[PDB]
Amino acid sequence: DDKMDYDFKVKLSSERERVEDLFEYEGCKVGRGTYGHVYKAKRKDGKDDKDYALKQIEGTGISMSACREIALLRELKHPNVISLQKVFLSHADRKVWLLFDYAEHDLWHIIKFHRASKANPVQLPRGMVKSLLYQILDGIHYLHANWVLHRDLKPANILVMGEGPERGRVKIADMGFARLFNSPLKPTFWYRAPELLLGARHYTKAIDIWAIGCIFAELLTSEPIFHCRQENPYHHDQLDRIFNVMGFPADKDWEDIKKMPEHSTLMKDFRRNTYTNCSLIKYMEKHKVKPDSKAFHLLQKLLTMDPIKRITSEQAMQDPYFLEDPLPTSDVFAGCQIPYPKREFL
């Protein structure tokens, strides 16, 4: 700026750490997104040897989305929630870089691995599933107690630390930090709560918990419980999938459903009789999960159709499932070898 003090300007520029001087990352892209691209990065100034994740925020400047993501990451600190290490503001291109510890694994790739072994195992260490679930709930609970919602929870967003000091530790990542007016109506559906599909106007704690329920059904079976063809909040076939698994809610199960904007469309399109022999029990039995297991009863509390009847994250952490043998381990791999491959470089 012509009329911004020169000395100040050159002094800040002399001292300003630039991402490209401190990290080697070109060619090492490991993820893409509308939100921004992620690189595996190693530290040039070799006083370190761990891997790091560099997120380059999409677009230029500080958008409302960027501003909120920096603002909240800057404050949040929990072992089960990805931890911002550093922000780089690159003044030449007005690009923003965020620095995280690198996480080798995630549940999208872990689950896909076990599903591959069904062609030719379902989560080998005994308490891996339990341990994963417990840590997901722990970190979601931290966010919920800070009145921070995730709003886009799914297996790809549940990272898992590999070899290192945090081996086997879950790291919830990629919160949806900006949603205008906290609205899902503003610019897959497999993890979306039924109230969303019937036109809920706001994200809630309970919508996150449904997604956790879906992830937990997927860890027990390796299939997405609410898998649907890839064909406005109302999505008919996704509702059809939910009901084939769960059954159709009775008036008593979800009294306030009649207040949903899309309730009348649901009545136009669907009939209770279509699903009369459908239940979560029957679904999970066909995937070799016992209906009288503590695992099943917690799962059913998490996949409750009425959001107000859905258990909270804190109540789910207190569930006796986590007291039954085997206990959850801080390393979900419980000292066993990690058979999951490392990250392919996109």
Binding site: D2, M4, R68, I70, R74, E75
Partner: protein, 267 residues
């Protein structure tokens, strides 16, 4: 925006931006080579009022305006008024503050239009000439503001605690409007850089009780707070109202603004 509401004791606000008063005055001595201590306080008052005016034009809620005010105080707690023109910084702070919210959006044209209009209609006694900066200057300044604040954007304020206290008192109709108003005036001082919000809130509610001759001695006794720090804050509030009496910003600000140190141009 309840995001992070209970987390003040582990917050970047508390761990990084509750400053020591002595460090503050020490870093202030550089701009005291051009301005007396009165004149520096009068400036501070002026740009609080400038930031408030902008916030109102843009229909921002008080908490957003407060955050903008706090961004501004942080920047000049470290740096001289000459490093970036505070006429450019004040609207930058408002814009940045407002993007920390997800309910609403302040467009570029709307920001620039608000800055131009507010200086002309409400501050022509201090500014003869029209607002000279374009949006490209705003975006530049944003980057330096973000850098300086170490990306610490979440800021706690006394309004939330104050509501809890008046509700607890069972005195919301009698006391909230005044107390709220006194909380606004604390931003004319350094207090938000020196004490946690709930302590400013308590100080404000005490002063409101004194003005309305309401006996609250037992309520305050029943708290567990460093009351000497509270008294410190009351004394700053009382003094501010004495500086406000004796200050005519409309007559004085053009002259104090001419004494402000000026940016060095490039070679």
């Amino acid at each position: 925006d309840k995001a992070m509401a209970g987390n003040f004791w582990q917050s970047s606000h508390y761990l990084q931006w509750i400053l020591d008063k002595q460090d503050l005055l020490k870093e202030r001595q550089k701009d005291l080579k051009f301005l007396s201590e009165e004149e520096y306080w009068k400036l501070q008052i002026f740009f609080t009022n400038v930031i408030q005016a902008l916030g109102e034009h843009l229909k921002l809620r008080q908490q957003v305006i407060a955050t903008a005010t706090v961004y501004f105080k942080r920047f000049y707690a470290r740096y001289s008024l000459k490093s970036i023109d505070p006429v450019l910084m004040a609207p930058t702070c408002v814009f940045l503050a407002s993007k920390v919210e997800e309910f609403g959006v302040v467009s570029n044209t709307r920001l620039i239009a608000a800055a131009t209009s507010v200086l002309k209609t409400r501050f022509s006694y201090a500014f003869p000439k029209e607002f000279p900066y374009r949006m490209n200057h705003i975006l530049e300044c944003e980057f330096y503001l973000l850098e300086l604040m170490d990306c610490c954007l979440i800021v706690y304020h006394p309004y939330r605690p104050l509501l809890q206290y008046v509700q607890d008192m069972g005195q919301e109709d009698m006391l909230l409007p005044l107390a709220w108003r006194i909380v606004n005036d604390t931003y004319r001082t350094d207090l938000c850089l020196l004490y946690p919000p709930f302590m400013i809130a308590l100080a404000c509610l005490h002063v409101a009780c004194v003005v309305q001759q309401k006996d609250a001695r037992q309520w305050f006794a029943e708290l567990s707070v460093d009351m000497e720090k509270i008294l410190e804050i009351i004394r700053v509030i009382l003094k501010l109202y004495e500086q406000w009496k004796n200050f005519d910003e409309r007559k004085e600000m053009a002259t104090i603004l001419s004494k402000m140190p000026k940016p060095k141009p490039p070679p």
